[PDB]
Structure formats: structure tokens, C-alpha cells
């Protein structure tokens, strides 16, 4: 319970009330491989979308709960959406975290899964952490309760405990949707406009390939890939469930820091949720010929479609087979600032 | 004598039993509103 009293006196500037929680290792293992993170709070609104300041959450892992039943990581969620009096709760209201060590993996949590279980679980001197002395005397089992998670179907333990007035006001609060409805529709909107840009670039040209990346191709390429076999190019737009892991936003976050290339690569047909948001590097002493080795290793991928984004506002789609279709990236810069505030600072 | 006022406190206990059914009763209406 070390992180509980570690960000309860630090996050009190940006947030009135702080919640203490657990994440099991089993539920967040598909967020990040090999438990590489060791956070950033950004609660987005359901009907009142906007943008909010980012709050920092101190989390430390590898340390168990008081229960021996499950052993997982520690976390905390700030609650600061409730304007003025926090007696109102916003229902169907997400809270999004950016847990990280070196930014990797994302977590989304409803306020309703949080708050329903929070009521369910119930000549100087040196300065003393009065919260630390008050935390130490509870030390019991029923402070922690297991609550199912609506995003990912697992039990997420919250630890609340009759500590002080700050949690004391918390369980007395009650009040009388569309928060994940927007982010899917937004990403599919920009994916539809990108596929329309590729449609008009294939239309103003002949229906042909320019083949930016060289790779050798067999004679049976029109057989083993059928005539107008755009099955992957059909279903590409359904396969992009994520955006903030995608390389599509990696160009927009890298405009201010200069310009490299980013790759969203997907399986020809359901071979696995492959890869999102990687780098093609010209900075290190691998150099431009080292980046060209990566790009020909990209074009030689015979079982994956590829999408390329540049940081300067251009988008490409590399077919398996070295073929490519040029395209444009440009969008209304309100959504640029929207994504830039969704990730971090403007 | 001493058996009079408990009959009055029983209706005060019934008063909260009457009024706190609305706290349940608006909640299924909220369930129908959301779902």
C-alpha cells in the first residue's frame, strides 16, 4: 500500500480525491509484454469531450497485495471530473491511464466500476505523514474487494478503507454514455478518409503500382494472390481497432520533436493482431542504408499488408509485393490538437 | 401509560420504510432509461 500514500499528497494539487487500486498481472499482461512498464492520468468525458490536464500517478510493481489469493501490481486513479461539488457522479464515464517505464500500454476504466465497488468494499520536530500512520492501523482483509472490468473481462481489485474525510465524502456521493462510442467512430472516420485519399490517388492515376520499394515477384503472383485481391485492403479498416498504439498518430506526436517514418503492419488475413506504431530510423549510425535494409525487409513480407506514415504529412500503403499507393495525411488541425492533448501536452 | 409512545415511534419507523422505496423505485427507471 506504498503507492497509495505516495501519490495521495503529491496528486492532491491537480486532483481533490484519489482512489487506491490493484491491477492483476493476468489482466494487464496483454497490455504490455514482459511487464516492461513500471503513470499518466487523463480522464476523458462522455458527453463533455474537451481536453484535460495530465496527472501523474506513482505506481510500483512486483509487490503483492495483503491477500495471498492474487498477486499483482499497484496503481491509483485520480477523480477530478466532478465539477465543484463532487457529490454528483458521472455514469458511463471513462478514466484513461498511461502506465509506463520507458510509454507502453494503456488502461481505460469506468467511474461506475470504480465507485460501486468503493461502497461495496466497506527546536523543531520532524513532520510526520499523518496519512501513513492512519493507513497502517487498518491493515485488514476487507479493505480490498474484487470488481469486474467492463473493458477487459477480469476482476480489478480496489482498496478503500475508512481513512479520513477525503475518502469519507467519497462513499456518500451518488447521482442520476457515449465515452467509448466516440473514440472508435473517430478512428474509423480518419481511416475512412485515408482510404478515400488512397481511392482518389488510385483513381486520378491509372490503376497501377509505382513500387517505391523493390522486391522480386514470382510469375504466379496473379494466381496465388487473385485478380483484384484486395481482401486485406477491404478489411484493413475493420482491423484498426487501436489508434494511440497505431503509427497513424506517431507522426502527429513527432511533428514538434525531426521527421522519420512510422509503420502500421497488419497479417494478410487474421494471422494475429500483428504490430502497431514502430519506427524507421535515419538517426543512428545504421544510417539511410540501414533504414533501406529495414524497408526492403518490410517489402519482402509476403504475408502482411503495410501502412506508412511520414511525420511531414504524407501517408503510404505498402502492399505485400513491394507495390505502394501514395496518399495524403492532412486533416483539420483541431483534431491535431485533439490527438496531441489526448497523448500529452500541446 | 408507558405503552403509548412506542405506537408513535412505530409510525416514524414506517415513515422511512415508505420513503426509502422510492430510492429503489427510481433506479429501475434509470435502468430502463440507460438500457
Amino acid at each position: 500500500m506504498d503507492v497509495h500514500i505516495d501519490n495521495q499528497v503529491l496528486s492532491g494539487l491537480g486532483t481533490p480525491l484519489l482512489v487506491h487500486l490493484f491491477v492483476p498481472d493476468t489482466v494487464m499482461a496483454e497490455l504490455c509484454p514482459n511487464r516492461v512498464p513500471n503513470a499518466w492520468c487523463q480522464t476523458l468525458f462522455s458527453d463533455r469531450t474537451g481536453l484535460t490536464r495530465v496527472c501523474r500517478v506513482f505506481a510500483a510493481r512486483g509487490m503483492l497485495p495483503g491477500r495471498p489469493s492474487h498477486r499483482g501490481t499497484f496503481t491509483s486513479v485520480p477523480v477530478y471530473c466532478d465539477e465543484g461539488l463532487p457529490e454528483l457522479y458521472n455514469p458511463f464515464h471513462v478514466a484513461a491511464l498511461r502506465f509506463y517505464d520507458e510509454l507502453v500500454g494503456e488502461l481505460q476504466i469506468y467511474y461506475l466500476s470504480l465507485f460501486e465497488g468503493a461502497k461495496r468494499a466497506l527546536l523543531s520536530r520532524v513532520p510526520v505523514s499523518f496519512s501513513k500512520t492512519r493507513r497502517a492501523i487498518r491493515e485488514s482483509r476487507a479493505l480490498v474487494r474484487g470488481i469486474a472490468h467492463i473493458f477487459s473481462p477480469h476482476a480489478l481489485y480496489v482498496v478503500t478503507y475508512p481513512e479520513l474525510s477525503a475518502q469519507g465524502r467519497l462513499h456518500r456521493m451518488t447521482a442520476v454514455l457515449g465515452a467509448p462510442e466516440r473514440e472508435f467512430r473517430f478512428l474509423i472516420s480518419v481511416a475512412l478518409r485515408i482510404s478515400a485519399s488512397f481511392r482518389e490517388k488510385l483513381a486520378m492515376q491509372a490503376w497501377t503500382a509505382q513500387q517505391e520499394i523493390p522486391v522480386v515477384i514470382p510469375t504466379s503472383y496473379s494466381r496465388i494472390y487473385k485478380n483484384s485481391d484486395l481482401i486485406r485492403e477491404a478489411f484493413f479498416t475493420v482491423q484498426t481497432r487501436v489508434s494511440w498504439e497505431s503509427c497513424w498518430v506517431k507522426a502527429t506526436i513527432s511533428n514538434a520533436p525531426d521527421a522519420c517514418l512510422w509503420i502500421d503492419s497488419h497479417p494478410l488475413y487474421e494471422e494475429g493482431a500483428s504490430a502497431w506504431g514502430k519506427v524507421i530510423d535515419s538517426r543512428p549510425p545504421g544510417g539511410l542504408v540501414g533504414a533501406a535494409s529495414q524497408l526492403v525487409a518490410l517489402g519482402t513480407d509476403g504475408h502482411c499488408v503495410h501502412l506508412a506514415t511520414t511525420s511531414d504529412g504524407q501517408a503510404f500503403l505498402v502492399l505485400p509485393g513491394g507495390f505502394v499507393i501514395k496518399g495524403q495525411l492532412a486533416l483539420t488541425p483541431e483534431e491535431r490538437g485533439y490527438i496531441l492533448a489526448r497523448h500529452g501536452i500541446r | 401509560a408507558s405503552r403509548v409512545l412506542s405506537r408513535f415511534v412505530s409510525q416514524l419507523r414506517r415513515k422511512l420504510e415508505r420513503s426509502t422505496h422510492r430510492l429503489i423505485a427510481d433506479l429501475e427507471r434509470l435502468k430502463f432509461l440507460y438500457l
Binding site: 458511463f92 469506468y110 461506475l112 466500476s113 460501486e116 461502497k119 461495496r120 470488481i147 469486474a148 472490468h149 467492463i150 473493458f151 473481462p153 467509448p180 462510442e181 | 419507523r13 422511512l16 420504510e17 426509502t20 430510492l23 429503489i24 433506479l27 429501475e28 435502468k31 438500457l35
Partner: peptide, 30 residues
């Protein structure tokens, strides 16, 4: 959205049962 609403009705349903079990306190003195 359907499986979201299914877990969403299962997380709200225990709230009204916890409220009823809180109302069952006043049962014990009546």
C-alpha cells in the same frame, strides 16, 4: 457494445442489491 452493456448491467445490478441489503438493516430492529 453488446458485451459492454452486459457487463454494464451486471455491475449496476449489485448496486441495488447492496442497497437492499443496506435496507435489510432496518428489518433487524423491526
Amino acid at each position: 457494445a453488446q458485451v459492454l452493456k452486459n457487463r454494464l448491467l451486471r455491475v449496476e445490478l449489485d448496486g441495488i442489491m447492496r442497497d437492499h441489503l443496506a435496507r435489510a438493516e432496518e428489518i433487524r430492529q423491526d
